Amino acid sequence: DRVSDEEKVRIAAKFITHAPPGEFNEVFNDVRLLLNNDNLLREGAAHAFAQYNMDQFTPVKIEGYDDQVLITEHGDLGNGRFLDPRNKISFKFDHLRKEASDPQPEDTESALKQWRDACDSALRAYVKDHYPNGFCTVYGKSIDGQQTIIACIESHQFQPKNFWNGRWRSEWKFTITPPTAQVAAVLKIQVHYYEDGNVQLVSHKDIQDSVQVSSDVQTAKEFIKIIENAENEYQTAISENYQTMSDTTFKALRRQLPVTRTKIDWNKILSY
Amino acid sequence: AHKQSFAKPKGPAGKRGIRRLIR
């Protein structure tokens, strides 16, 4: 009759990893009271809290350092530590409180570091110019023997008092095979409005591109221009598609009024 | 028109069986 501990954890993890942006605490609290097994939730679903933060690109402030660093899979150093590649530190991250502690120096020197730094510098300016309170983190790694730059952007607005929350995430991977670089990206938007009922927008777009590679500073300039053009285009297309969706799909599901352009004559209906 | 504020009526009397999801 009892639900196995394995299934309680699996279902808790499922709800947690599907929490809207900015609503982790509410979903965690619902789940806690449904399970009535705090140690099982905290130990058994630990992987789910970490997965949520890394999926969401959760930004965190590290005491004593400008700006915030993103929690992502690319920064996961294991044992609950993450990498801040701009400030060249690792730090402990509490996935429940979303708090950073215990910063320690991290040796990040490599032949790719100059490229990561040039891309990071160009990306920071880009994000500050194009987002209201965006953050970004740039990684440089060897992936199957290939030098890779990974640029991550996050921007959110949480307004629980007005019952809505939203988040933008984008992830740009540049595989550098001189004299070229291959570009693969995903852009993502999630919005939850729940003043009346429960409405959610979920959107994503895949991007593939190629680019010529020159110097580290000039290539960074070109990388950010690709990002800028694609993200500008995606955003405008979104806003335009709202109008089109209403004009086509929405009206096709239910009209505002019958073709008579008046509400129904029910005595006419019943007399037929 | 307003948010949920009163109870829905009872369903048909003398129905047999528990509620369940349809697949």
Binding site: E7, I189, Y194, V202, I238, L257 | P12, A13
Partner: protein
């Protein structure tokens, strides 16, 4: 209870695109919630075929007896039942008239789809459900209406509890994949004259029409206004 309120709060936050699996997961997690949770949260509508009359009809708890469901056209259960629950003779006549009335209603507002009406007796009147489903490769959508009406005959007092589930998805070059899903519930009340001028079905029809028009406009404002403005506030 608190576990029910937590379940209902989770359904307010988990992706509406997955209402069915959300409910199933909650009931698996806490089986004693099943009855109250399924009576509080409507599920997406499912279509069945009445092979006797040759017509589609919609499934809900209100036309379910055991594991069979009653068609509003044939007034028979599928699979057949020995003595399944059935409206009184007086109400069945009203039920036939209501299904025909709401077929016309649905044609005029939805230009397709499927509708079903089921009525049942109460001590001092009757109650009913009005169900409407309309569907839309790269451009999909679904509207599901569930209207539950309570009628207390005195003149008559009508109480209406209405849920609309609406989701739309596009997959396009510029905007990639865009998915809007949601669920909204509203209630209204009304006293009416009952006569050959305004019989019960006309009173109920006007109530349902008013409610759906109002909910449609609210969905329009939230989907294509509020979430759009939030998106643009993100960047």
């Amino acid at each position: 209870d608190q576990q029910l309120d937590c379940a209902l709060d989770l359904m307010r936050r988990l992706p509406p695109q997955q209402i069915e699996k959300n409910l199933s997961d909650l009931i698996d997690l806490v089986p004693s919630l099943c009855e109250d949770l399924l009576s509080s949260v409507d599920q997406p509508l499912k279509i069945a075929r009445d092979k006797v009359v040759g017509k589609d009809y919609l499934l809900c708890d209100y036309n379910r007896d055991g594991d069979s469901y009653r068609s509003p056209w044939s007034n028979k259960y599928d699979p057949p039942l020995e003595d399944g629950a059935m409206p009184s003779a007086r109400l069945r006549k009203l039920e036939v008239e209501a299904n025909n009335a709401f077929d016309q209603y649905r044609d005029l507002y939805f230009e397709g789809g499927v509708s079903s009406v089921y009525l049942w007796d109460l001590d001092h009147g009757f109650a009913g459900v009005i169900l409407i489903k309309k569907a839309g490769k790269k451009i999909k959508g679904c509207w599901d209406s569930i209207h539950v009406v309570e009628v207390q005959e005195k003149t008559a007092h009508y109480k209406l509890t209405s849920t609309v589930m609406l989701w739309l998805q596009t997959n396009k070059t510029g905007s990639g994949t865009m998915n809007l899903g949601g669920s909204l519930t509203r209630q209204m009340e009304k006293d009416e004259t009952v006569s050959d001028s305004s019989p019960h079905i006309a009173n109920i029809g006007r109530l349902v029409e008013d409610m759906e028009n109002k909910i449609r406009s609210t969905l329009n404002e939230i989907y294509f206004g509020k979430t759009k403005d939030i998106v643009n506030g993100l960047r």
